[PDB]
DNA sequence: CAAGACCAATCTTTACACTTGAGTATTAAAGTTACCTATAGCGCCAAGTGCGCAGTTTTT
DNA sequence: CAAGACCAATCTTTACACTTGAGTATTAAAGTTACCTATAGCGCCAAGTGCGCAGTTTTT
DNA sequence: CAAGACCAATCTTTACACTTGAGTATTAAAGTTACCTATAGCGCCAAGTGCGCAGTTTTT
């Protein structure tokens, strides 16, 4: 490595911040300038004070402390390996030993020196800069030679892309002339001038006479060594000159650094500010791809070996980005060699830095990694879900219009493996999230045996929550009692009614409440019923019926190019009363396009529609004994589950509820034939349902608080989830912005 | 925003029901009498314990919860502070090559109540709580203070074992924390404090922590508010120190 | 030029402390005729009122004027002075967002009573913005747009049928585009700029209007990313995505690395595909 | 610092269109106490008067304020607005000479009633001036 | 345009660290024909010579060139590189005087062998100069 | 008696050695340094012009 | 015993009073402040869901 | 019959030859140019897959 740690105490927006475990690529994300620019300012100030530049001291986070400290730990293991060896008796190695490693090995005895040599040791050098209240600066190492040498060995290069200069390439030369160590001091500039003017002269002297005349005319400063080397290099190069222009500038910068550092022991640290600014997304992805290609082409491992491959450590690259494309490409290409840093705000307003897990052991997840997955890294609050219906509901524009707080939460569907290797808890990240799952993932009910059985994920949750089996006593006893009740859930048997459709005495709502209360500390919320079960509730049945009326009255058209003769012929052939179902089947059909019909045809269609609506209401209220049976039938017909958590396919395979299944089949094949294509889970009936419902209630009432109250009454559970999420969002927003 | 407790704040949030009668009847809130305080003896030390049934315990606990926890402190105080610990008190001295450890003799017994009033005054509104008889600040100090029957000479005393004594000690000693931190930092010494135990470490190669000058200067700084250094617990060593086991 | 003014806002080189375009915009947009109100009458009027003693302020200002050699006041300067004196405040990454958002709010609010319909062109509105910040910027613009919108349903005092200004903005971020498409529905247009055979510029209109409300709701960052794609390989299952995205396989074929592989259902393919959108983003639909 | 302010005028890098130091100088020099005059009272007062219909200007400004997110007015901004609105004009080699001459005229005229005695340092007043122009400036 | 070039030197906005006009002037004034000297031949020639080991400098420069994407060298850039490498120094109120004086010295000295007769226009040469300094410049 | 705090330069800036990519006991050459100075009132000598080398206060 | 070094805020920024240009004994109003918060595990009560108020180490 | 206005490139940019400072009859080498492309529906041939070369309108 190059830098082991950076620690800032009581400076700018930092209270006490320690950054370590630096990888080869460090991606910095978060809310803008909540400490990003402050960290950059801290690093720049430390490296400016390292080279004895007169720069203004930084401000204190709170004036109730006398000083602020910046501690840099350099990893000098490789340099110790470089110099302690006998072969390299050069002047530079000798000076490096006398400066950095002496006064720390002198104190040691022979045994400890041997132990340090022989062991697989790591050597560190800690330098602390302290700013007092009266602007004075104190170093923990009082030798300026140490500071200058540390500045040389670990140079800091800052590249800003917004204010980049596409025609000023001076940093390129200042970088290349320094990186590769050519000793032109031994080559006299007097000898070099005589040498070059000996050669390039057309006549030996003619060029020299011209240059001597110029020099006698022009009053020039003596050449500095860096100027000499820059002249050398860019004269020998076959070219001095060189949105996409900034990309090329940055890409050549990184290529030069990575290529040139392979032969040197100097390991620079490069910080890039918004590399993607002014870049097409494909251009940013290609920039990261080119950087990775340069990185891996020069990489030597146990497999890749040969001339042209080195084991020299690579420079440490920080870059602060705001685009998911850069982050996605980094994560995909760099694997285990990158780190993602998240910047947020504490309670007292100070900056908080976290490391988000971006390394995945599942290669499939790395390959399928796309823009949507990389977007979650910028999320303020995540609502992980399980199916597409949840995404359809929680993303509904009309619903989120009435709840602006929930508009800041990103809803993402996560599989069990995806959730296992993405979730913030395992990533120890401070991006708050909630995992919304159904209660069926823990307990499965058997009608034949009338018994609940426990799912493995419930056992895993119990094992995670039973951490008190290895510890002492405190106020956690109620949790143990709840876990005991969860254990007793297994042995209990419960009787069913109507061949396994309803529970005699048991309320799954109470068990769901207990599970949610217990597991809220694990950030998982368990909804009592499915989303399609939550929308189809007893309170919203009128509006649901209204919706059906709408899809009959407005979304239906006539299946004939000649409405008049068609409607007359099927009025004649099929009776309005005794044959309403086939008449409606032949006459009406669902169609996006609504051709204009005649007044008589429109009146006849309206009359048939009203008659069919009355018939359907009568038959719905007649065939089903109670409203609960109606709700259950509608839920199953759309793919839902009963109070016993059984799907229509599950019942068909098992063979229970034959009468209810046949009734639903009769309704779908006779009365609800038009709504059959919308019976599927992916039909998008949720969006139309919610849009019509919210528009209708807005027509009913004109107050925003009142409309929220009505929506809460209609969908108690979905609105409860939304309100809990919004309250948590506001709490964590006060945790960040408050 | 600096916390500011006023009459409404005391009436609603702090007093709640513990002193409802005293606030509606306009009767002065009284001192913590000897009946509410029991005196335990631990070696040569004496500890003061207030009964939970008394309203003073409730108001003290709520004072810790809502008022004392909001006043800012100094970063060198690693004791009785949210997030502080002994390991955090020892950590900044790993970079030091010489170590010195000092103690304050009877830290809590030597905390003058006048200093406490001066420290808590800017954070409490200068109002009259009860008519023109008792001030709000004096009522709160009544809540936090005590008169030891063993030693009536000192009058008001902050006793060990109360609800609010540690945090009040930290707030009153923030002044010396700042002064000692400034001195040590200008000398290049890393300083930290846990209760009354102060630890200094010099990372450079020097005999500063071993000279009598350092002890004299720390004693001179402590003398401003009347504290003293326990000379039996003064320790100075090079290249390693064994502080109470660590 | 007066009836259809052109306002260009560049966000990269925006000036967070120079708000002169704001005043040059507001003083022009709402048509108040201060010419009838004499500046002589106004000066006498204002110095009559604001004077502590009638004349004292006037004596001080007269001394100043005798000292300072001033150009005659231009009408626009007069109106700017008027407005920002009457306003309760002259002063005002996120700073640029606030600048742009207040610009758009001022335009949309002020143009409702006038027949002047400006055209506003924004250059990279999302530059230096967190993705959530850009999405919130588009959301705020849409809220301002719809709150002042009067239709057959929404009517009342505070709702106008005045045509809105035409807003162009050139973006490079899928977040801005996704939020626009989601929020504006049928009222937005997506323009694609490419190059012809002979190197000349070619402009196309990409279909961003969807009749399937479910597709509008499920619209996410991945779907809006395809608008920037050089070449699309539409597929049917997750296995295709696993194969064609394999890093080791794409290492050996750098040409295919520029093609985005997206899984599309039949309905999604029906309402997204470039053929129905007559767009020049070449694509191939791989099916069994 | 208040009683003996320091004003530095550089003529080479002078800005012929940025006159902010003029306002920062005049608003400070003559001591008018506008703090006693409430900005709430002043806003109501001014919008009472300048309104074509009492409220019409106020309705327009209220719509603007609801639209524009503004910082609270600083006192110096208030005084600068006051002065240059009441003045019959905001706008104004030889241009630099006029800038400097009006600066000195404002200082000398305004300091007569105050006990504040500023110190003014000018860097190359004659830069870019015809000799007769410099003599006329003096 | 070539035979009678026009050079304009402004002293107020002169850049004491940007000396590009000096090179653009000297590379043009004295007519050396480096076109006959191949830049391929010159690159091989120079890397033959300046190499510590014949090729070592060339290997380093070839690695750089493979890394850096460079435009082809323009002739004026070639000549400027030539001259200021061969010169014993690239780097250089009174600073502006020295800039102008060296400009005039270079022009007068270099034009003696050429038939190109430039016209040079100076804007306020005395700006920021002590009177004795201006007299010494003349 | 007895001790933490024991100037600021000294020419300066850059920098690998060994056999071409990894390495377990202690600074320096070199380009520029990069330019400096004899002897100030008194004495010797040509012999009155020109050249060579008997205060106060404070520390004390 | 005995002492130099005795936090940082506390709302902040600006500023004449008297009779219109000189003047020999002690801060402040005002615009904005400009927005804050009860109650986190345990106990009471409806009676098992929902609402109100028996550790280690270190100082000691 | 009879005429002013008779594309824009064509590779591009720079530039002394003769014996070292003045001189009275006609463009160019050279570095980069600096990189290009066979064959798009129909016919031949392996013989139905794969490879090689009978419209409208307007000018007329």
Q: Both ends of chain E: CA-CA distance in Å? A: 28
**Phi, psi dihedral angles at A3 (to 5 degrees):** -120, 125
The DSSP call for residue A98 is I
Q: Within 10 Å of residue A606's Cβ, how many Cβ atoms?
A: 11
Report the C-alpha gap between D84 and D27 in whole angstroms.
Answer: 10
The DSSP call for residue B12 is I
A738 to chain B: closest CA residue? B1
**H or E stretch including B46?**
strand B45-50
Do C12 and C124 meet the contact criterion of CB atoms below 8 Å apart? yes
**Pairing, β A443-446 against β A451-454:** antiparallel
Method: cryo-EM
Residues 6+ apart with CB under 8 A from A695: A398
- Determine if strand G comes within 7 Å of the CB of B217: yes
Report the C-alpha gap between B124 and C246 in whole angstroms.
Answer: 67
Nearest Cα to Cα of residue B49 among B146, B173, B167, B153: B146
The full 3-state SS of C166-222, as one line of letters, equals: EEEEECCCHHHHHHHHHHHCCCCCEEEEEECCCCCEEEEEECCCCCCHHHHHHCCHH
- Nucleotide with the nearest C1' to E40 CA: H31
Report the C-alpha gap between C178 and C242 in whole angstroms.
Answer: 25
Cross-chain Cβ contact E60/A180 below 8 Å: yes
**Phi, psi dihedral angles at B237 (to 5 degrees):** -155, 165
Nearest Cα to Cα of residue A340 among A348, A332, A349, A330: A330
Q: Using alpha carbons, list the distances in angstroms from residue A330 to A257, A258, A344, A414, C126.
A: 18, 17, 21, 22, 21
Report the C-alpha gap between A5 and A43 in whole angstroms.
Answer: 12
Nearest Cα to Cα of residue A519 among A443, A455, A462, A445: A462
Which tokens is A270 given?
A: 């490069």
Residues of C in contact with D63 (CB under 8 A): 109
Distance B19 CA to G29 C1' (A): 38
Strand H bases near protein CB (under 7 Å) are 13-17, 20-23, 29-33
Do A10 and B181 meet the contact criterion of CB atoms below 8 Å apart? no
Report the C-alpha gap between B196 and B102 in whole angstroms.
Answer: 8
Report the C-alpha gap between A661 and A666 in whole angstroms.
Answer: 9
Report the C-alpha gap between C226 and C190 in whole angstroms.
Answer: 13
A168 to chain E: closest CA residue? E18
Nearest Cα to Cα of residue C109 among C35, C34, C25, C180: C25
Our CA-based measurement puts residue C57 at a distance from the nearest CA of chain D, in whole angstroms, of 9
Cross-chain Cβ contact D124/E124 below 8 Å: no
Nearest Cα to Cα of residue C179 among C232, C224, C130: C224
**How is chain A split among helix, strand and coil, in percent rounded to 5?**
50, 15, 35
For B71-135, where are the alpha helices, taking DSSP H only?
86-90, 113-120
Q: Using alpha carbons, list the distances in angstroms from residue A394 to A390, A406, A726, B24, B147.
A: 6, 9, 12, 52, 63
Task: State the resolution, in angstroms.
Answer: 3.2
Angle at A336 between CA A331 and CA A340, to 5 degrees: 50
- At A264, is the secondary structure helix, strand, or coil? coil
Cross-chain Cβ contact A220/E91 below 8 Å: yes
Sheet of strand A338-345, all strands in order from the earlier edge strand to the far edge: A156-160, A269-273, A316-320, A25-30, A338-345, A351-356
Residues 6+ apart with CB under 8 A from E136: none
The number of residues making up chain E comes to: 138
Which tokens is A498 given?
A: 């109507």
**For chain D, how big is the Rg over CA atoms in Å?**
19
- At B229, is the secondary structure helix, strand, or coil? strand
Which tokens is A664 given?
A: 């639903």
- At A413, is the secondary structure helix, strand, or coil? strand
The DSSP call for residue B237 is E
**H or E stretch including A176?**
helix A170-179
Angle at A440 between CA A439 and CA A445, to 5 degrees: 120
- At B5, is the secondary structure helix, strand, or coil? strand
Do A465 and A515 meet the contact criterion of CB atoms below 8 Å apart? no
Residues of D in contact with E127 (CB under 8 A): 127-128
Strand G bases near protein CB (under 7 Å) are 2-11, 13-17, 20-23, 29-34, 36-39, 41-42, 48-50, 53-55, 57-60
Report the C-alpha gap between D57 and C34 in whole angstroms.
Answer: 12
Our CA-based measurement puts residue A250 at a distance from the nearest CA of chain C, in whole angstroms, of 18
Q: What is the full DSSP assignment across chain C?
A: --SS-EEEEESTT--SS--HHHHHHHHHHS----SSS-HHHHHHHHHHHH-SSTTHHHHHHHHHHHHS--PPPPHHHHHHHHHHHHSS-S---HHHHHHHHHHHHHHHHHTTS-S---EEEEE-TTTT--HHHHHHHHHHHHHHHHHTB--SS--STT-B-PPPPEEEEE---HHHHHHHHHHHTTS--EEEEEE-TTS-EEEEEE----S-HHHHHH--HHHHHGGG-SEEEEESSHHHHHHHT-HHHHHH-GGGGGEEEEE--HHHHHTT-HHHHT-S--EEE---
Do A131 and A139 meet the contact criterion of CB atoms below 8 Å apart? no
Facing residues of A270 across strands?
A: A157, A317
Distance D67 CA to G30 C1' (A): 28
Do C263 and C211 meet the contact criterion of CB atoms below 8 Å apart? no
Report the C-alpha gap between A181 and A88 in whole angstroms.
Answer: 15
- Chain centroid offset of residue A612 CA: 51
Residue with tokens 């305080």: B37
**For chain A, how big is the Rg over CA atoms in Å?**
37
Report the C-alpha gap between C285 and A216 in whole angstroms.
Answer: 74
- At A198, is the secondary structure helix, strand, or coil? helix
**Pairing, β C6-10 against β B235-238:** unpaired
Cross-chain Cβ contact A238/E70 below 8 Å: yes
**Pairing, β A14-20 against β A3-11:** antiparallel
Long-range CB contacts (within 8 A, 24+) of B143-146: B143/B29, B143/B56, B143/B59, B143/B60, B143/B63, B144/B60, B144/B63, B144/B116, B144/B168, B145/B31, B145/B32, B145/B113, B145/B116, B146/B31, B146/B32, B146/B37, B146/B48
Residues 6+ apart with CB under 8 A from A717: A527, A528, A529, A534, A537
Torsion sign over Cα E82, E86, E92, E98: negative
Residues 6+ apart with CB under 8 A from A564: A598, A600, A601
**H or E stretch including A328?**
helix A324-334
Residues of C in contact with D49 (CB under 8 A): 45-46, 49
Report the C-alpha gap between D107 and A164 in whole angstroms.
Answer: 44
Do B228 and B110 meet the contact criterion of CB atoms below 8 Å apart? yes
Cross-chain Cβ contact E67/A259 below 8 Å: yes
Tally of CA atoms within 13 A in the half-sphere of E40 that contains its CB: 0
Report the C-alpha gap between C237 and C217 in whole angstroms.
Answer: 22
- At E61, is the secondary structure helix, strand, or coil? helix
- At A2, is the secondary structure helix, strand, or coil? coil
Q: Do chains E and B meet with 3 or more Cβ pairs nearer than 8 Å?
A: no
The DSSP call for residue A222 is P
- Nucleotide with the nearest C1' to D31 CA: G15
Report the C-alpha gap between A629 and A657 in whole angstroms.
Answer: 12
Do A272 and A159 meet the contact criterion of CB atoms below 8 Å apart? yes
Report the C-alpha gap between D39 and C88 in whole angstroms.
Answer: 8
Residue with tokens 């003029």: D22
């Amino acid at each position: 490595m190059t830098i082991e740690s950076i620690r800032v105490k009581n400076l700018l927006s930092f209270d006490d911040v320690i950054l370590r475990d630096f990888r080869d690529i460090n991606c910095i994300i978060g809310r803008n300038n909540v400490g990003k620019s402050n960290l950059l300012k801290v690093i720049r100030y430390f490296y400016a004070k390292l080279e004895n530049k007169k720069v203004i001291p930084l401000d204190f986070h709170t004036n109730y402390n006398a000083v602020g400290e910046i501690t840099f730990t350099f990893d000098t293991t490789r340099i110790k390996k470089i110099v302690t060896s006998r072969k390299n008796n050069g002047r530079f190695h000798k000076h490096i030993y006398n400066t950095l490693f002496k006064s720390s090995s002198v104190k040691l005895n022979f045994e400890e020196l041997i132990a340090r040599k022989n062991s697989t040791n790591k050597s560190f050098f800690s330098l602390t800069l302290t700013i007092c209240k009266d602007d004075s600066v104190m170093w923990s190492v009082d030798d300026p030679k140490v500071r200058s040498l540390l500045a040389t060995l670990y140079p800091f290069l800052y590249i800003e892309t917004r204010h980049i200069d596409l025609y000023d390439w001076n940093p390129i030369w200042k970088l290349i002339s320094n990186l590769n160590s050519f000793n032109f001091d031994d080559v006299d500039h007097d000898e070099l001038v005589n040498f070059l003017d000996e050669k390039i002269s057309s006549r030996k002297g003619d060029y020299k006479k011209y240059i001597d005349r110029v020099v006698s005319v022009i009053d020039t400063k003596p050449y500095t060594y860096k100027e000499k080397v820059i002249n050398y290099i860019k004269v020998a190069i076959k070219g001095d000159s060189f949105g996409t222009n900034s990309n090329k500038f940055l890409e050549t910068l990184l290529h030069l650094l990575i290529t040139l550092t392979r032969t040197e022991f100097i390991s620079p640290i490069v910080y890039i500010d918004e590399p993607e600014v002014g870049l097409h997304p494909k251009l940013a992805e290609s920039f990261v791809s080119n950087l990775n290609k340069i990185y891996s082409k020069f990489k030597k491992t146990s497999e890749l070996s040969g001339p042209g491959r080195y084991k020299t450590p690579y420079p440490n690259i920080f870059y602060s980005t705001h685009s998911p494309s850069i982050l996605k490409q980094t994560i995909k290409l760099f694997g285990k060699d990158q780190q993602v840093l998240h910047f947020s705000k504490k309670k007292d307003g100070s900056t908080r830095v976290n490391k988000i897990n971006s390394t995945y052991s599942d290669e499939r997840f790395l390959n399928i990694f796309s823009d949507n997955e990389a977007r979650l890294f910028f999320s303020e609050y995540i609502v992980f879900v399980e199916g597409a219906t949840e995404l359809e509901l929680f993303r509904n524009l009309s619903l989120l219009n009435l709840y602006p707080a929930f508009s800041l939460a990103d809803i993402y569907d996560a599989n069990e493996v995806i959730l296992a290797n993405i979730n913030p808890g395992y990533s120890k990240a401070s991006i708050p999230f909630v995992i919304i799952k159904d209660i069926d993932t823990l307990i499965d009910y058997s009608i034949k045996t009338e018994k609940f059985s426990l799912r493995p994920l419930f056992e895993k949750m119990i094992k995670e929550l039973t951490k008190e089996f290895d510890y002492y006593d405190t106020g956690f006893g109620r949790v143990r009692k709840e876990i005991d009740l969860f254990s007793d859930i297994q042995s209990s048997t419960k009787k069913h009614m109507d061949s396994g459709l309803f529970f005699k005495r048991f309320s799954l709502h109470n068990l769901s409440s207990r599970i949610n209360k217990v597991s809220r500390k694990l950030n998982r919320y368990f909804m009592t019923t499915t989303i399609e079960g939550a929308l189809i509730n007893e309170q919203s049945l009128p509006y649901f019926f209204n919706w059906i009326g709408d899809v009959i009255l407005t979304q239906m058209t006539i299946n004939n190019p000649n409405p008049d003769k068609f409607i007359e012929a099927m009025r004649r052939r099929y009776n309005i009363k005794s044959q309403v179902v086939p008449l409606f089947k032949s006459v009406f059909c669902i169609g996006l396009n609504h051709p204009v019909y005649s007044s008589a045809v429109d009146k006849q269609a309206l009359r048939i529609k009203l008659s069919f609506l009355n018939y359907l209401k009568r038959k719905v209220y007649s065939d089903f004994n109670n409203e609960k049976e109606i709700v259950l039938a509608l839920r199953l017909a759309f793919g839902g589950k009963t109070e016993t958590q059984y799907t229509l396919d599950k019942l068909r395979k098992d063979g229970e509820a034959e009468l209810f299944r046949e009734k639903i089949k009769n309704y779908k094949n006779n009365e609800l034939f038009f709504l059959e294509p919308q019976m599927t889970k992916t039909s998008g009936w949720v969006t139309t349902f919610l849009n019509y419902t919210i528009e209708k209630i807005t027509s009913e009432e004109s107050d925003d608080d009142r409309i929220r109250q009505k929506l809460s009454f209609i969908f108690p559970e979905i609105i409860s989830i939304i309100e809990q999420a919004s309250s948590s969002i506001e709490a964590e927003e006060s945790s960040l912005t408050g | 925003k600096m916390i500011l407790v006023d009459k409404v704040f005391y009436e609603k949030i702090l007093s709640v029901e513990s002193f409802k009668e005293n606030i509606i009847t306009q009767s002065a809130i009284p001192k913590i009498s000897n009946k509410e305080v029991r005196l335990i003896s631990s070696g040569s030390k004496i500890f003061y314990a207030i009964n939970n049934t008394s309203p003073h315990s409730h108001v003290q606990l709520r004072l810790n919860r809502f008022f004392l926890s909001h006043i800012p402190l100094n970063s060198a105080a690693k004791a009785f502070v949210r997030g502080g610990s002994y390991l955090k008190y020892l950590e900044p001295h790993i970079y030091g090559s010489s170590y010195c450890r000092l103690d304050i003799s009877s830290f809590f017994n030597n905390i003058s109540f006048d200093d406490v009033k001066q420290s808590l005054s800017p954070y409490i509104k200068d109002e009259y709580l009860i008519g023109t008889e008792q001030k709000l600040i004096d009522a709160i100090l009544n809540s936090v203070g005590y008169e030891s029957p063993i030693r009536k000479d000192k009058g008001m005393i902050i006793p060990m074992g109360f609800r609010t004594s540690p945090a009040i000690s930290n707030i009153v000693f923030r002044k010396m924390d700042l002064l000692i931190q400034d001195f040590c930092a200008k000398k290049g010494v890393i300083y930290s404090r846990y209760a009354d135990d102060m630890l200094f470490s010099n990372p450079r190669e020097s005999k500063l922590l071993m000279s009598d000058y350092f002890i004299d200067e720390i004693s001179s700084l402590l003398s401003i508010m009347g504290f003293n250094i326990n000379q039996s617990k003064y320790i100075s060593r090079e290249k390693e120190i064994s502080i109470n086991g660590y």
